[PDB]
């Protein structure tokens, strides 16, 4: 009953239908990053008894980010050659 | 080799800047034990002003060790 | 007097003295640059 | 209530809590007494 | 850019004009110095 649905709702056959019904302009990129931040915020943070997990996630994410950034310079000391 | 031993020497020399810190440390702890012995009330602020100097001495101690390594391992 | 014209305690004399010495150091550096 | 309100809602209920912008244009819009 | 200016020029105006007149000069000096030093090293390595 709807053209645009949550990408999980849509099927594989109409997969490209979803890919083409949606927009791509940078404004529609900010209007996505914002939605992500605000889902996280209003679901795990803006609550009267926020916990560690309300924060630890972004930290342990930034961690993996800056690990991926560094992969190149770390292929030079693998303790074993044939992995 | 010669540059190697020279790095070694510069390192063994730069090691010594820690004595200012060791002194300042014992000094300020004596000062604290005193200023508490004759006023056991305001322990809290005495201890605060103890560690705030602790830090400002270890800073220079580790300046010196840092330059030592900086030479030894990375020129 | 001059110890009241080159004061070291008030504001004025201090300024006058510091200016005298900046001027003097300037003149000597410009006299020695020749050599 | 309180939790359902904002700073402007306090401007609304209590004008004496107002941080006036003339005598203290800067932050924190008042002195530190 | 209208949202940008209406987010970062309504509040931050009285600061850049009245107070911070004296830091921008310093930043210009900073630019002077960084220019000088980058030029010097560019020169010295252009040599080698």
């Amino acid at each position: 009953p709807l053209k645009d649905r949550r990408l999980l709702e849509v099927k594989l056959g109409e997969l490209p239908s979803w890919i083409l019904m949606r927009d791509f302009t940078p404004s529609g990129i900010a209007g996505a990053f914002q939605r992500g931040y605000y889902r996280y915020y209003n679901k795990y943070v803006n609550v009267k008894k926020g916990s560690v997990a309300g924060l630890s996630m972004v930290l342990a994410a930034y961690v993996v980010f800056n690990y991926c950034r560094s992969y190149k310079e770390l292929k030079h000391e693998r303790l074993r050659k044939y992995h | 080799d010669i540059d190697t031993a020279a790095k070694f020497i510069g390192a063994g020399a730069a090691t010594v800047g820690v004595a200012g810190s060791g002194a300042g440390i014992g000094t300020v702890f004596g000062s604290l034990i005193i200023g508490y012995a004759r006023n056991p009330s305001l322990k809290q602020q005495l201890f605060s002003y103890a560690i705030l100097g602790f830090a400002l001495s270890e800073a220079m101690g580790l300046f010196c060790l840092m330059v030592a390594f900086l030479i030894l391992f990375a020129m | 007097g001059i110890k009241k014209y080159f004061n070291s305690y008030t504001l004025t004399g201090r300024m006058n003295c510091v200016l005298a010495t900046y001027g003097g150091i300037a003149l000597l550096v410009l006299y020695f640059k020749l050599r | 209530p309180f939790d359902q309100m904002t700073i402007e809602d306090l401007n609304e209920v209590f004008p004496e809590t107002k941080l006036d912008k003339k005598k203290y244009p800067y932050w924190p819009h008042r002195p530190i007494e | 850019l209208q949202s940008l200016i209406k987010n970062v020029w309504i509040p931050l105006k009285p600061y850049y004009t009245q107070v911070y007149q004296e830091i921008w000069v310093g930043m210009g000096l900073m630019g002077f110095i960084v220019y000088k030093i980058r030029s010097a090293d560019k020169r010295s390595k252009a040599l080698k």
Partner: protein, 94 residues
Amino acid sequence: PVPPLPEHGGKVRLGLIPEEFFQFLYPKTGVTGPYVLGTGLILYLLSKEIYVITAETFSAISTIGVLVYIVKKYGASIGAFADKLNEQKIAQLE
């Protein structure tokens, strides 16, 4: 003219990963699918050396040990601390 909040949002396992994952996975393996899943993910990363081990490893271990110590010892104290500040503003105004 503003909305209120819950009492506590999405519950979480290990304090790091959410549970909704687990339930979404309940139909097929139920309970002991996610745990072995992660164990395998990690033994894989380690085996093929997608994650070589060095000093920074132990640095991370130490920082994390410190942090968990701190929280598991001071958490609710800080929570009540903050709720106290809130109720205190409420009163001092009220």
